[PDB]
Amino acid sequence: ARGPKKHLKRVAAPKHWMLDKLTSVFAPRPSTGPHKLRECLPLIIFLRNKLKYALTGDEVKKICMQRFIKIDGKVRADITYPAGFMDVISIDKTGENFRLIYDTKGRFAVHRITPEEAKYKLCKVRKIFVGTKGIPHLVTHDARTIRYPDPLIKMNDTIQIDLETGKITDFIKFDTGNLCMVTGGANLGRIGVITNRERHPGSFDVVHVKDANGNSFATRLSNIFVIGKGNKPWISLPRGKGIRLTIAEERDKRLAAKQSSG
Amino acid sequence: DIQTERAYQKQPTIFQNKKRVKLPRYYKNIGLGFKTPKEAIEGTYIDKKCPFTGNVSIRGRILSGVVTKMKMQRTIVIRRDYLHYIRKYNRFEKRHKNMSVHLSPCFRDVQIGDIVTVGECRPLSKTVRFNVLKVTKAAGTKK
Amino acid sequence: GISRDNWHKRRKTGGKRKPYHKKRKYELGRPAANTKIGPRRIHTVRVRGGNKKYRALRLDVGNFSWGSECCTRKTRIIDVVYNASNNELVRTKTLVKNCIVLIDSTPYRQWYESHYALPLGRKKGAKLTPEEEEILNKKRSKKIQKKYDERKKNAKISSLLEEQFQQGKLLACIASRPGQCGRADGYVLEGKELEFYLRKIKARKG
RNA sequence: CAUGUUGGAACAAUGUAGGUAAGGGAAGUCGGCAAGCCGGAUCCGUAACUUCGGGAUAAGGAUUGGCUCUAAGGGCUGGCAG
RNA sequence: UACCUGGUUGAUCCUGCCAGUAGCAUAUGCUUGUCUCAAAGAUUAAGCCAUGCAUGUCUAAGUACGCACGGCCGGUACAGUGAAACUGCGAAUGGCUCAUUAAAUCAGUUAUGGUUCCUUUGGUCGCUCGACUUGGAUAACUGUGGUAAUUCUAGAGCUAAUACAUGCCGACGGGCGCUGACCCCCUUCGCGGGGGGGAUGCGUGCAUUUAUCAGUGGUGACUCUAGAUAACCUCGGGCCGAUCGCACGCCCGGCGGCGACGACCCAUUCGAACGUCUGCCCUAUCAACUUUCGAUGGUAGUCGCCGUGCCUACCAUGGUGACCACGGGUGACGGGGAAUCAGGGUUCGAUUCCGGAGAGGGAGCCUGAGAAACGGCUACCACAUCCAAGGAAGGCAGCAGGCGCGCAAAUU
RNA sequence: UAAAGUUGCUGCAGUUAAAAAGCUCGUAGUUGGAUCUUGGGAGCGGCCGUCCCCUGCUCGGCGCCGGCCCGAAGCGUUUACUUUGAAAAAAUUAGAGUGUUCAAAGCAGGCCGCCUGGAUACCGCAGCUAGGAAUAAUGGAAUAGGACCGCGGUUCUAUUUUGUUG
RNA sequence: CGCUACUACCGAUUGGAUGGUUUAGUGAGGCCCUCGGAUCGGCCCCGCCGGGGUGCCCUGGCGGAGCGCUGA
């Protein structure tokens, strides 16, 4: 341990890939990139297990080295590229666009969208910076350092950016009553409206988030990602729309699914 | 009065060679709402490690303790007293982890038995990683 | 080599530590620079993260700032007078940070001649026969002479600095680290700090 | 004061009184007799045993010249100056 | 399944152990048809190793004049392949073992506002008055050789680059801060006076130092991020592009697309590193310990990537302990865990996941972003190999396998 | 390891089976009497059973004309205790679904391209946080160097304001 | 008290053998510092004269130093 590690053990992999242990010792250690090792999909996992285009790892080699896959309108040919939250994956030939959005359970959903929906994506601001000659910079959650952003776009706001240009199309400020997605902790991938953010100076701030069925869960400010205003989001939402229906209520629907459609 | 030492004691913020026809002080507020005392603004003392007049940033753990020893130079030994739980014998046992805290001379009148609320900062010395942020003296108060 | 570890020595209680690992590299000590005053010699070190660190073994010409009048000039370092830490760093004329030196006075006297149109030093009756410097003390207009006559009221220097211009050498204090930067940057002493270091020089000598 | 109550010239043995010896080092001898090693000071360290006083300068180690420097330790005169 | 039974007596009731009873995980004895999972030289010797392998690498995109091949017949150099070999990245991951180590390792929790970071990713890459390709070696090659011997290298003769070097056209016309010949203008009795225009020379953008006008934005809180002015720019130098090939089209010697490679710096990602709080097994036949040769603080430096007695000079006399310090032992790597359990506990955890440590014992370092690296070197110390006696060479606690050791553990 | 209630916290023994120091003092350690907002109301459930109270002075309205109050936020004796939330690698264990032909397992599968899982708990202590205020610690005025006041002065620095200009 | 068998104990021997830490002495090798200078290139004014501007001179075929200064 006298330098950076290069392997990842399949047992000690992030839980929300769902990798069966009896296959191999190792998992796809994601290449360094715009998102963290824990909270990202690598490309091979998405294109092998979830879609079943590839049976093996040499097949995602043969797919990516013909360069049909374009992540965020940029042609990525690295099988272990970390595609994190709100990163839009586009297959140009198939004509399908998939946004990576968290599921009800806290896994990355196979959520398809329109080509209209593909051209733009939302990015949470991580910090603002003042550049080399009073140039306001602005770093997002996917390392996008946009320069000359609007003076009202501050620290924890969310910016709709176009992919062709990389400029800010529109923005949403951190308002109590806006929709948001919890992107970590126990409440991972639930949509709700902000009621209060508890101010604790020094330590982390906690936000109280209420989903549409009328259920109040709290989380840290680190995981909350504002996605719209009031009742309507700016993004397509997946099936369920992050309500988190409980284990008894899931069995009540799984009953009716295999009883009615049989 | 001050500067009994080999090198000139001053602050690295102020400049004290203005041209003529009461040198100013460098104070700051510490954060997390702590009242910076009058003695750290009207005072004359130079101290490198003071969190009001000197250079140190308070961040991390705010602890409390009761003062034990005051024989060092601008340093004191406080006592933290707590109850370790044993699961087998479903009871507790008295322990203590007495620590060495840096005391700024803006706390002019301190005796033994006072309750000091101390803040975590970078290592000041070998075994000093805390600064007294307020002093709260025990029962009595007068004689 | 030279370990900078905190585990080779005793605990707070006064018990002997056991080493769980041997000397690591990131625990690193290089020998000192001991930067003497001579014709400029600087070596370089390849440090952690493939960066540079300039080992000034000798440097003669520093860069000192007159903070009061506000003029910074690349000036000659001449003689060491005081060192707070070790008295053997004044015997062996080394250059460390916060070390008191005698710098050349002529690049500041030149600027005080130019900016104010006054002299500095210059003994009673000692006037200039070759006539080069004294052409800076005369011949303005009758309205840009009036520009200079605003500067002259708020001109007069500190009387403790007057002597360090006539002798031709200024008490200066180094601010940079010659071992680390390969430089002897500092500032000229004036005010209370000057009076303090003048006493501590004068105290021993006698 | 005039070498101890005399001078001169030689430099044999054997003496008395000093010294030094390669390699070994008590084998010599009744017996280490005689000679030799150790030796002052400053800083370390110091056993068995003991009548607790000692043993003890136990045993065993290191340093020591010359020169040029620095630091600390004081009096008299009306936290300072001379 | 919250359980007991035999044994002291002539006989009885107790205390009390001994012995039975069930699981588990090591060895071994006897016995054996099918099928499915499957631990395995940990305990003793972190003992010793013959032999073989375990780390190499090229796309259209740094460098091909090997005919080793080869398409073309005569093309303004170069078709395509191509061993070398030089470049530049990897070899610091993985794998093995558990020897050391008892607030150490490690676990949860927090700090980096106290640092470093190859790569990936996104920024910035004509902001700086200030040249249609520039030097001269060197490997493979060729030809000569030396020693018994090594993945030993010498002398000689060529030639390349994204290696090693050196350097400027362009943007470029100016803008901006001092310095100032002289210029516009009257006031009042000419001196004083109230504002402007300007012939100049200089300094010019992010690193070291010191300053205030200040403080465009941010913090729980900065000596923060930016802005302004005066200098400095390390010959062991901060960049400021002499690199490469895809399609080559526009226009009358200029313009232009699509990408590699490269670059000081900023922000990421992977981390690493030092610190915060709390937590461990037996021991008083270990009660006081630390400090002159740093022990705990103050101060000013040195060094380091950074905070700090980390280290050096001056000071101060502190620091810890019956709430078990200090010293010692451990068949002690720590934890996630495992066996057994009515409930509470007792014992185990070398062992595939995380963190640590070491490569026969110690010590030292070169290169690199990152080793104090051992399938890298340099010494000594044990062991031990080839020798023509002059000298070379070696590190299986990697995979197999052999010896030894044992109660104890697999196919070169 | 259980049986071992033959190491005992739950949970053992000490007159005679093994065992209370010869006696008292005494420091850590451990443990420490009682005492402080209780009743009763109030509307609506069906004589009884819940909600709310013996607390205060930056910012929006259902507004009226130097102001008559409710809505968001800086605040109010300290700690233990309990309650919930945050945050907590998988694997293992407990467990949900699923006919590996059963099972131990594993993470898959089902219907004639579609549908569908890959949950969920547990994760002692220590730290973080917000309710509750019984129990147990702890604080305040008794040389009044007291709470509430409205008053009268002693000094320093911004801005609401002095027609530009000092 | 007398026989056998086994296990611990004291004990002259200034006993013996393995480790572990460590005081002194000597101290290999690496690293830094002050030197060093085996060697290998620049550059210059002259000489024989070219070659071209008109003896100036742009570059070269050569010999020679005070090795002049300078680099590694």
From Swiss-Prot, chain A:
Assembly description: Component of the small ribosomal subunit. Part of the small subunit (SSU) processome, composed of more than 70 proteins and the RNA chaperone small nucleolar RNA (snoRNA) U3. Identified in a IGF2BP1-dependent mRNP granule complex containing untranslated mRNAs.
Any one Gene Ontology cellular component term annotated for this protein: cytosolic small ribosomal subunit
Keyword Glycoprotein: no
PROSITE patterns: RIBOSOMAL_S4E, S4
Family designation: Belongs to the eukaryotic ribosomal protein eS4 family.
Domain S4 RNA-binding: 41-103
Keywords: Acetylation, Cytoplasm, Isopeptide bond, Nucleus, Ribonucleoprotein, Ribosomal protein, RNA-binding, rRNA-binding, Ubl conjugation
Name of the protein this chain belongs to: Small ribosomal subunit protein eS4
UniProt cross-references to InterPro entries, sorted A to Z: KOW, Rib_uL2_dom2, Ribosomal_eS4, Ribosomal_eS4_C, Ribosomal_eS4_central_region, Ribosomal_eS4_central_sf, Ribosomal_eS4_KOW, Ribosomal_eS4_N
Organism listed in the record: Oryctolagus cuniculus (Rabbit)
UniProtKB/Swiss-Prot annotation, chain B:
Function: Component of the small ribosomal subunit. The ribosome is a large ribonucleoprotein complex responsible for the synthesis of proteins in the cell. Part of the small subunit (SSU) processome, first precursor of the small eukaryotic ribosomal subunit. During the assembly of the SSU processome in the nucleolus, many ribosome biogenesis factors, an RNA chaperone and ribosomal proteins associate with the nascent pre-rRNA and work in concert to generate RNA folding, modifications, rearrangements and cleavage as well as targeted degradation of pre-ribosomal RNA by the RNA exosome.
Entry's Gene Ontology cellular component terms: cytosolic ribosome; cytosolic small ribosomal subunit; nucleolus
BP terms from Gene Ontology: translation
Subunit-level organization: Component of the small ribosomal subunit. Part of the small subunit (SSU) processome, composed of more than 70 proteins and the RNA chaperone small nucleolar RNA (snoRNA) U3.
Gene name as annotated: RPS11
Modified residues (Phosphoserine): S57, S100
UniProt KW Ribonucleoprotein keyword: yes
Entry protein name: Small ribosomal subunit protein uS17
Lineage of the species this protein comes from: Eukaryota, Metazoa, Chordata, Craniata, Vertebrata
Source species: Oryctolagus cuniculus
